[PDB]
Design a protein around this ligand. Structure first.
Ligand SMILES: COc1ccc2sc(N)nc2c1
Length: 165
């Protein structure tokens, strides 16, 4: 199963890891993508997960958007996990660099509660512009299922662990 994680709470675990390398190693039931409403996996976690699937995630996502239209900010959809996981849960956290309501981060994390165990990044962190310390706090206060958080940046990982209440 998941190895090398630091236990933060009863159900939240954290590791300094590349979520792509982590997914290829574990091949979890669910890997969470830090998606946008259009499922355009250009950069950040989305660009990295999509590149690991040789663009199969983007091809599948474009067909999903053509049929269903865009997701809502705070919403999600379950698609294939390709070579990384059984499924990919594409979750849209608010992008504060696009003026989206940070209050939607709790709604975004509520999507994780539909899955018993997930490999995930911190929602709205990185290129989404939110404070990762706040994202971790919303994660532990919202997610009740088993969430294994992969934090790419060692210095951010240390700051998250050392400041965790
Ligand atoms: C390989 O690129 C990336 C980019 C962002 C993230 S967040 C995370 N935990 N792992 C990654 C890996």
């Amino acid at each position: 199963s998941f190895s090398g994680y630091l236990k933060l709470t009863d159900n939240v675990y954290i590791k300094n890891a590349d979520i792509v390398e982590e997914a290829k190693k574990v091949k979890p039931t669910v890997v969470v993508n830090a998606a946008n409403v259009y499922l355009k996996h250009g950069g950040g976690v989305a660009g990295a997960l999509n590149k690991a699937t040789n663009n199969a995630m983007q091809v599948e996502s474009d067909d999903y958007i053509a049929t269903n239209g865009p997701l809502k900010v705070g919403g999600s959809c379950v698609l294939s996990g390709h070579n990384l996981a059984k499924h990919c849960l594409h979750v849209v956290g608010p992008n504060v660099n696009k003026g989206e309501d940070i209050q939607l981060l709790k709604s975004a994390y509520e999507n994780f509660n539909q899955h018993e165990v997930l490999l995930a990044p911190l929602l709205s962190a990185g290129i989404f512009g939110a404070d990762p310390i706040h994202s971790l706090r919303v994660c532990v206060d919202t997610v009740r299922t088993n969430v294994y958080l992969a934090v790419f940046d060692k210095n951010l990982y240390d700051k998250l662990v050392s400041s965790f209440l």
